[PDB]
Design a protein around this motif. Structure first.
Motif: not given
Ligand SMILES: *[C@H](C)[C@H]1/C(=C/c2[nH]c(/C=C3N=C(/C=C4\NC(=O)C(CC)=C4C)C(C)=C\3CCC(=O)O)c(CCC(=O)O)c2C)NC(=O)[C@@H]1C
Ligand SMILES: *[C@H](C)[C@H]1/C(=C/c2[nH]c(/C=C3N=C(/C=C4\NC(=O)C(CC)=C4C)C(C)=C\3CCC(=O)O)c(CCC(=O)O)c2C)NC(=O)[C@@H]1C
Ligand SMILES: *[C@H](C)[C@H]1/C(=C/c2[nH]c(/C=C3N=C(/C=C4\NC(=O)C(CC)=C4C)C(C)=C\3CCC(=O)O)c(CCC(=O)O)c2C)NC(=O)[C@@H]1C
Ligand SMILES: *[C@H](C)[C@H]1/C(=C/c2[nH]c(/C=C3N=C(/C=C4\NC(=O)C(CC)=C4C)C(C)=C\3CCC(=O)O)c(CCC(=O)O)c2C)NC(=O)[C@@H]1C
Ligand SMILES: *[C@H](C)[C@H]1/C(=C/c2[nH]c(/C=C3N=C(/C=C4\NC(=O)C(CC)=C4C)C(C)=C\3CCC(=O)O)c(CCC(=O)O)c2C)NC(=O)[C@@H]1C
Ligand SMILES: *[C@H](C)[C@H]1/C(=C/c2[nH]c(/C=C3N=C(/C=C4\NC(=O)C(CC)=C4C)C(C)=C\3CCC(=O)O)c(CCC(=O)O)c2C)NC(=O)[C@@H]1C
Ligand SMILES: CC1=C(/C=C/C(C)=C/C=C/C(C)=C/C=C/C=C(C)/C=C/C=C(C)/C=C/C2=C(C)C(=O)CCC2(C)C)C(C)(C)CCC1=O
Lengths: 67, 161, 54, 160, 296, 48, 161, 160, 161, 101, 161
Positions: A2, A40, A44, A61, B65, B83, B87-88, B112, B116, B121-122, B125, B129
């Protein structure tokens, strides 16, 4: 596993490098999922603009079997 | 990134003119708001974890969710969502201190939305949040700092839109 | 004609700041309010709606 | 200490301390009388502050002391009071130093590892320190209450 | 029975705002001895002490108005703040209100109120039930309470109920001191501004004496607010130059400078031989209890 | 090294002892010995 | 690293006691010295380049080290000495401002002996340059600030020896 | 699946599967019948297993469901029952797969962060999975008892 | 490193011969050990955190070691000690399941005494920690498995001292 | 002197809130009550809840202590511990018709 | 090694300066303390045979150390322990007579820490025994002489730490 492929444009904000620099200023790489968040954050913080990112490898998913 | 002062300085420098009366007024406004912003930052640093926990509980917990087949389902995705919201919160506090949204634009919003989209990712949703986080932080900090904190969080949600 | 019968026990090592021995009496003076043993057996609880759904 | 933090930042940037850092150190050293006085006040109110802090903590979460909790008996509650005295001493250290580096160095690095190896509820520890802060603010001058509350708040955030 | 908790929830549901509020108040009264004990630390009260302090600062009439607005889910900022909180936050907030009422910090209920029949039946059911479903029923009852923007309604509003005697001193019957005590119980400091002379020498507890009639008026308007003074007895003696020294001891049935609802307060009055009240000193006698201390 | 340069041996000046440590690391061929050039830095001040 | 205040803190905490009267006295003494420390540090930062220039002029220039074949030959190496003297002066200022010379033996003296031995640096020449810097800074800043700066610089010299 | 694990190892080494991996997959495919039997038994006796283990956990740690606790309230005890159901089904998945990959991927990675957010005592959860281990071992055969115990041991150690 | 099986293999190979009867009986002995070692490893993996927890609670915990002055003070040093115990336990399990201490003395004894001396670590307190590890492991693995585990941990202690 | 104070011993200075803490009372003694002479005159003693001994002592202060030199009455409210140590001591400066304090 | 007088002389020699008022007052202080030190030395020489006996009795008898496995076990080790304590007593009396710590710096603590570490002997219990002999000598000699003896002894303990 992935992996993610990203295109990012990273300008130079401190030094005027006199040799060729497109290869690291505008690049499209393949990033593993585990390292994508760290990469990332680093990009940034270095000030680059993430033009595009997409999950080239893997399925969204997947509740199991993602490696 | 930028703050209020750097934003004003750049706004003047783009046309290459000195800081006039309007720039000084804006700088005075930020200087007055600095004490309030610092106090709100202290409060949010106090209650960083609790704000996120309350926001997720009132926003996502025991909902679609979190159930099997939901994006927040499974421990790994729960940890990822936690996480992301942490971070948000931290970066919204950063923007509140700086008085400017440039930090959010170039550190929380580039890469970002399409991330998503790639992950499925929703967005609808995560927007709610973030709104729950806004409500919790408003209740903690108070209406005064809470209004600007909600302004920054609404900026985050709009960029995520 | 008194005599000093030294005992088995080693001389008691003086209490230190780190040791909670000096906090032992404070805890006793506290006497924290404990909790009664809950009367729940979970057998008649059914996991279809007893778990929250919000 | 604040001086140590400023020195570390200056070393990281490989430069002398900026005028802002120098004036901050100057203000801290000039105003240190109040910080030393407040450290003295907390040291004096140490026994009581711990007493009603632990009492309020146990009332707010008796499960930690109830059967099954970490400190169920008077013995382990005494150990819990001992830890609370540790954290009071650390907050006193932070107040005298002026910066949170002593707190991080002594009682916030690997604290999650410590309180996951001990099974202690870290949320309970945070609540105990919060009640500590509330009672200290009650028995302290309001502005000085905020001065100590900065460090209490930092410890609370790190614990949570 | 498995459905005991949902049945009790529905039974609480049909009850009105007055019934719900009375039931929760009596539940707090029975709490610990009959109902589940309270462990408020488990809830994140840190996002609730703001509203708690606001309600404490609010006056008793507006206090009860806000409480009834929350009970009937009125559209108020406090109602929305309560509603946005998590259910454990709501329950802890209600418990804090109960503690404040028990300690006198907030306007308590009318004296000698009795529960309705339906609420009494539901509370008996709650007492019969186990602690787990007890707390579940309480949480489910409190969750819908408070205004959330959406589809909701209340059948009948529970309006705030719209609704003084001379103080008796054992051994002291001075008209000036009696008028003083009665008009402070009535908050008649405007009358007191002439009831005592222009000297304005007042001695707040743990404080230096105040000087100036304007200073005393400011102190009365700011600090003294709805204080309930219940003096027990008193002794009057002649001071220098015919001054009357009156030492009157009683209790203050309201939180007052970190004072309990029952506190042995003592007033020493140097009253003018021809005027009225030259100096007043208020002292709360000590006991095996000290929470208002500030150290140094 | 950036996103395009293969890492190479460095000759840093700071922080303290980093230059001697890297020198001892790099002046020995592979598998020259099993000892530790820099097992850890003995702190001057011991906390607690 | 340790300063005059955290030194007292660790000294108390090794035995775990609280801050007694002696600790408060030590902290008050350091706070009294803080004015002189801050003034000396600001002056030294202002005149850092000139101080090292004068010390080099009166201690190293026109000698075997600077002559061809000497270690100060090969202008890269001269710039290296300039940078090294700058480092020594800046970290001495750090130690003086801290009130404890723990940063000197942590971030400065750590590995310095083996570094100079490997590079063939004249250790006594470097030490002499350090006393030249000490004399120059003492003359520039006064008797008491010069006292403290000389104390810390000579601690560095003793570490080199 | 151990097949997927072996494929991952082989592709990492850039080589075809070694005799060890071949023998491993052969043994797994031959024991798949017994593995499916164990999975079917666990699925059939899930509710009794989870309920008995949860009650044993309650007896071990009464404070978990005591007032002021995470499991307090019938909602917050039914949620424990639901979590135990989730972990039992995850153990069934791991047993039928032969490896711990699905367990680590669905209930082990991020679990500590989730339980930190929710305030749950992961040590208590480890005791609960232990109790589920004894209950399943009692309800299950002796020869397959060791096989199921291996995966229970893995989960207990990891989530401990 | 190596275990008993690789030891017999390379002992044969260095002389360049096939497996003689001595090697066959050595392999048979290791196979007979076999399931006992695998069961001990599985139970240790079960209660991994347990043995370290009660070993600390038995030997180090509530003492001057964990008090001020003792090396266990501060949460950082406490968690460092716990991490060291986890290293020691995993290496003990590896050495048990292998049958040789090559894994330990290649991954443990190399520079460990000198690094602990540089950190001023109490060798005696460490040895007591491994001892308590040994009894807690024995009480969960049995008699012979506990005995061999204690033998490996004793080799670790001897290398540490 | 302060050994007569309880470990939880508290002091109530005139016009000030109670001070709790042994070293706090030490500080009050060694930075507030500095070389002052007192002239106690009479007193009364009785019991009090939790086994305490409530003793109201009235005397005259002949030293400057927050004002009113010589012409001010010191009221020692001694809530002594049942063991004997002074659990709480309150010093009240009863004032003559003199004002401006 | 040098007494207080010789230490002052060597200090003034190192500065190349005559004995000024500070040196004269320090020397007068030592001269005043001479009578006290001599009488204390006479008394402690009287009781030297027994003083260590009661110190060890109140410190290290009927404890873990005296029993087998304890580092004081066996007549040889106990004789070594009593001889070590006698060494501490005699050399601390020497240091008290000289009014300077250099004798303990060079002839007592030089290598003693690593010697104890190699021998495996309990440094913590040695510290406790030194403290106990500190109270014993304080009670035997008085307040001021006991205080001087205690500062020498706990300096020894600090070095031994
Ligand atoms: C939570 C409110 C929601 C949610 C979260 C969720 N996020 C991931 C995966 C990632 N999220 C990020 C986020 C960021 N990278 C940045 O540079 C910034 C700046 C602070 C953010 C916010 C990233 C990079 C990823 C990918 C790498 C990682 O997973 O750590 C997931 C996993 C998705 C998956 O595994 O397929 C999830 C679940 N999910 C929800 O439903 C909420 C709305
Ligand atoms: C100048 C007359 C015009 C102009 C130029 C401009 N360029 C940049 C930044 C970059 N330019 C390049 C281009 C190259 N790098 C290479 O190596 C080569 C091929 C060998 C090319 C063509 C790159 C990569 C960058 C970004 C990275 C870098 O600079 O190292 C800037 C600065 C933009 C900024 O703020 O980041 C500018 C101003 N701009 C004008 O207005 C002129 C018309
Ligand atoms: C019970 C003995 C212990 C306990 C449990 C407990 N859990 C919750 C809430 C949740 N549990 C989970 C867990 C998972 N979701 C998944 O997808 C996976 C794998 C498939 C797991 C393990 C989640 C996500 C929640 C949040 C609710 C939701 O899912 O919508 C609670 C409720 C906490 C509260 O107060 O809200 C409890 C009580 N708690 C203990 O104290 C016991 C040790
Ligand atoms: C009380 C508020 C909470 C609580 C406390 C608790 N702690 C222990 C045991 C220990 N706590 C520590 C912590 C520290 N020691 C240090 O030196 C530092 C920094 C100065 C810290 C943070 C240690 C080391 C121990 C072990 C014993 C010891 O100190 O020697 C216990 C008992 C654990 C046991 O098994 O005995 C308890 C109960 N528990 C709660 O639930 C409260 C929230
Ligand atoms: C705890 C069991 C005992 C103890 C020791 C202690 N260790 C450290 C720090 C470190 N320990 C090691 C050791 C190892 N790392 C490895 O990878 C291996 C093999 C796998 C070993 C043996 C290392 C490298 C460090 C430093 C790096 C780090 O933090 O990981 C400390 C802290 C020292 C400090 O100065 O902070 C301590 C106290 N002390 C006791 O009292 C216990 C008996
Ligand atoms: C007694 C308080 C503790 C103790 C004593 C003990 N010491 C040794 C061995 C040695 N002790 C010394 C120390 C000194 N020798 C000197 O000349 C001086 C200079 C001032 C000192 C400090 C030395 C050198 C040795 C080694 C040789 C010897 O046998 O004397 C032992 C025996 C150690 C052994 O392995 O045989 C003992 C028992 N032991 C305790 O447990 C007490 C805490
Ligand atoms: C254990 C536990 C907890 C749970 C704690 C619990 C169970 C908390 C619940 C506590 C309860 C039941 C509180 C109810 C309080 C009722 C009030 C304030 C109503 C007053 C009514 C008034 C003033 C009206 C008076 C009126 C007026 C004025 C009139 O004049 C006439 C009419 C009327 C009489 C209506 C926590 C949540 C803390 C944490 C988690 C946890 O496990």
């Amino acid at each position: 596993m992935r992996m993610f492929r990203i295109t990012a444009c990273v300008p130079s904000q401190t030094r005027i490098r006199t040799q060729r620099e497109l290869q690291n200023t505008y690049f499209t790489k393949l990033v593993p999922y585990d390292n994508w968040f760290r990469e990332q954050q680093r990009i940034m913080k270095m000030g680059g603009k993430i033009v595009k990112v997409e999950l080239a490898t893997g399925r969204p998913g997947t509740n199991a079997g993602l490696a | 990134m930028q703050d209020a002062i750097t934003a004003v300085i750049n706004s003047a420098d783009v046309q290459g003119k000195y800081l006039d009366g309007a720039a000084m007024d804006k700088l005075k406004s930020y200087f007055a708001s600095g004490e309030l912003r610092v106090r709100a930052a202290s409060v949010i640093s106090a209650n960083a974890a609790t704000i996120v926990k309350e926001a997720v509980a009132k926003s996502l917990l025991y909902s679609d969710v979190t159930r099997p087949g939901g994006n927040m389902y499974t421990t790994r995705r729960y940890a990822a969502c936690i996480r992301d919201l942490d971070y948000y919160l931290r970066y919204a506090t950063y923007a509140m201190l700086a008085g400017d949204a440039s930090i959010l634009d170039e550190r929380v919003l580039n890469g970002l939305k399409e991330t998503y989209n790639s992950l499925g990712v929703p967005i609808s949703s995560t927007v709610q949040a973030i709104q729950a986080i806004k409500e919790v932080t408003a209740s903690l900090v108070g209406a005064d700092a809470g209004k600007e904190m909600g302004v920054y969080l609404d900026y985050i949600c709009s960029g995520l839109s | 004609w008194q005599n000093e019968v030294r005992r088995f026990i080693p001389q008691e090592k003086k209490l230190t700041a780190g040791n909670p021995m000096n906090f032992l009496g404070m805890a006793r003076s506290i006497n924290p309010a404990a909790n009664t043993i809950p009367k729940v057996s979970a057998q008649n609880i059914n996991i279809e709606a007893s778990v929250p759904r919000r | 200490s604040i001086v140590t933090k400023s020195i570390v930042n200056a070393d990281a940037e490989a430069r002398y301390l900026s005028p802002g850092e120098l004036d901050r150190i100057k203000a801290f050293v000039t105003g240190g009388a109040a910080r030393l006085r407040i450290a003295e006040t907390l040291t004096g109110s140490r026994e009581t502050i711990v007493k009603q802090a632990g009492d309020r903590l146990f009332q707010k979460r008796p499960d930690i002391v109830s059967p099954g909790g970490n400190a169920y008996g008077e013995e382990m509650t005494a150990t819990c009071l001992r830890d609370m005295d540790y954290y009071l001493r650390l907050v006193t250290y932070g107040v005298v130093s002026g910066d949170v580096t002593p707190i991080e160095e002594i009682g916030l690095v690997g604290v999650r590892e410590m309180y996951r190896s001990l099974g202690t509820p870290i949320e309970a520890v945070a609540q105990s320190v919060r009640e500590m802060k509330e009672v200290a603010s009650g028995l302290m001058s309001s502005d000085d209450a905020a001065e100590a509350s900065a460090y209490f708040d930092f410890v609370i955030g790190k614990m949570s | 029975a498995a459905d005991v908790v949902p049945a009790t929830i529905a039974r609480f549901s049909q009850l009105n705002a007055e019934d719900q509020l009375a039931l929760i108040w009596f539940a707090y009264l029975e709490m610990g001895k009959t109902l589940t004990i309270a462990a408020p630390g488990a809830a994140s009260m840190q996002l609730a002490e703001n509203a708690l302090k606001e309600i404490q600062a609010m006056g008793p009439l507006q206090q009860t108005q806000a409480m009834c607005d929350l009970a009937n889910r009125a559209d108020t900022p406090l109602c929305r703040t309560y509603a946005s909180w998590s259910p454990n936050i709501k329950l802890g907030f209600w418990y804090r209100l109960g503690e404040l009422m028990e300690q006198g910090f907030v306007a308590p209920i009318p004296a000698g109120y009795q529960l309705s029949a339906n609420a009494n039946a539901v509370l008996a059911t709650i007492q019969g039930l186990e602690s787990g479903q007890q707390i579940t029923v309480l949480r489910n009852a409190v969750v819908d309470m408070g205004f959330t923007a959406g589809k909701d309604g209340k059948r009948i509003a529970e309006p705030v109920v719209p609704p003084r005697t001379k103080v008796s001193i054992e051994g002291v019957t001075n008209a000036t001191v009696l008028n003083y005590m009665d008009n402070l119980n009535a908050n008649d400091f405007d009358t007191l501004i002439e009831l005592f002379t222009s000297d304005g020498a007042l001695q707040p507890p743990f404080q230096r004496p105040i000087v100036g009639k304007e200073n005393v008026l400011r102190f009365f308007r700011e600090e003294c607010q709805n204080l309930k003074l219940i003096p027990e007895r008193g002794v009057t003696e002649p001071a220098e130059d015919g001054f009357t020294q009156i030492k009157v001891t009683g209790k203050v049935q309201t939180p007052w400078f970190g004072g309990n609802v029952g506190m042995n307060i003592a007033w020493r009055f140097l009253l003018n031989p021809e005027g009225k009240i030259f100096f007043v000193a208020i002292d709360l006698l000590a006991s095996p209890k000290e929470l208002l201390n500030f150290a140094r | 090294f950036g996103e395009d340069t293969v890492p190479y041996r460095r000759f840093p000046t700071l922080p303290a002892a980093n230059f001697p440590n890297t020198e001892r690391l790099y002046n020995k061929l592979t598998k020259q010995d099993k000892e530790l050039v820099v097992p850890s830095f003995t702190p001057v001040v011991k906390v607690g």
